[PDB]
Design a protein around this ligand. Structure first.
Ligand SMILES: Nc1nccc2ccc(CN3CC[C@H](NS(=O)(=O)c4cc5ncccc5s4)C3=O)cc12
Ligand SMILES: [Ca+2]
Lengths: 51, 234
């Protein structure tokens, strides 16, 4: 589960009911696949700036 | 920072610099959001009044992306002790919001359990700052960053002349000449995960800098995550 490659989650992984539940830091929203984290605006936390 | 490299454009956008009345940098900080800066409580004993500067990579010349911000509230940890360097954490609320842009952006706050299981389990973290580049030298003029290996808690405890509390952790090298140093205190220790950087420590102290058999000591951010959340809610 979460110990196997972070559960395939982009960020936060939690093992609930024996199942993987992924989540994201503030400023991101969980993608439709329930694994990727999508930045909600420009300058999302934790990203080096390119412009 | 002793050893390591210059932070290149856009590479360390969450770095904040605390400056005194004479506009000199004396400590580091990490940008947490538009209004909050994370730093070391012990830095607060270092200046009568101070401001926070963001977006700076070279103190020798205004480049254009820099911005000074005055502090509205200094939230120091109630349990911090100058004597042991325990609870070396403080949150700064800024009077005006930081405007994110090139070289100016926040680092993400992780969740405790996942951070402890997956981030502090990583091989390395990254420390950065304008501090000394040699134990006895002067403050750096350019922002630098250094990759520092997480250090086994037991060897860390054995290497130190002072008590490594549960609010601290170790990183750095046994003999290799690289480590944070004076002036870097309060600065960011972040860990990269899938190209996203999370705040994992606050530059705290060490015995000299880059000394053989000694490591760099960092405030363990994952132990104050609730405290940080409370500090930013007020
Ligand atoms: N490496 C570094 N990394 C990061 C930031 C640093 C900031 C200052 C200095 C500079 N400093 C600060 C004090 C220290 N001197 S000590 O070894 O006598 C110590 C005495 C003591 N007593 C109680 C608790 C801990 C100690 S360490 C030193 O070298 C070294 C640093
Ligand atoms: Ca500058």
């Amino acid at each position: 589960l979460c110990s196997l490659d972070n559960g395939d989650c982009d960020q936060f992984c939690h093992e609930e009911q024996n199942s993987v539940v992924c989540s994201c830091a503030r400023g991101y929203t969980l993608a439709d696949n329930g694994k990727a984290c999508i930045p909600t605006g420009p300058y999302p936390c934790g990203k080096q700036t390119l412009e | 920072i002793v050893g390591g490299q210059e932070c290149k454009d856009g590479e360390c956008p969450w770095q904040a610099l605390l400056i005194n009345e004479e506009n000199e940098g004396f400590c580091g900080g990490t940008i947490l959001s538009e209004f909050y800066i994370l730093t070391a409580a012990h830095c607060l004993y270092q200046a009568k009044r101070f401001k926070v500067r963001v977006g700076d990579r070279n103190t020798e010349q205004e480049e254009g992306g820099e911005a000074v911000h005055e502090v509205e509230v200094v939230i120091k940890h109630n349990r911090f002790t100058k004597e042991t360097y325990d609870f070396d954490i403080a949150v700064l609320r800024l009077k005006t919001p930081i405007t994110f842009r090139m070289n100016v952006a926040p680092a993400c706050l992780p969740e405790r359990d996942w951070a402890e299981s997956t981030l502090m389990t990583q091989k390395t973290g990254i420390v950065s700052g304008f501090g000394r580049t040699h134990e006895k030298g002067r403050q750096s003029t350019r922002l630098k960053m250094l990759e520092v290996p997480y250090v086994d808690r037991n060897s860390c405890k054995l290497s130190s002349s002072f008590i490594i509390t549960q609010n601290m952790f170790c990183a750095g090298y046994d003999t290799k000449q690289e480590d944070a140093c004076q002036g870097d205190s309060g600065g960011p220790h972040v860990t990269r995960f899938k190209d996203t950087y999370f705040v994992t420590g606050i530059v705290s102290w060490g015995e000299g800098c880059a000394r053989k058999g000694k490591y760099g000591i960092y405030t363990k951010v994952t132990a104050f995550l609730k405290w940080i959340d409370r500090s930013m809610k007020t």
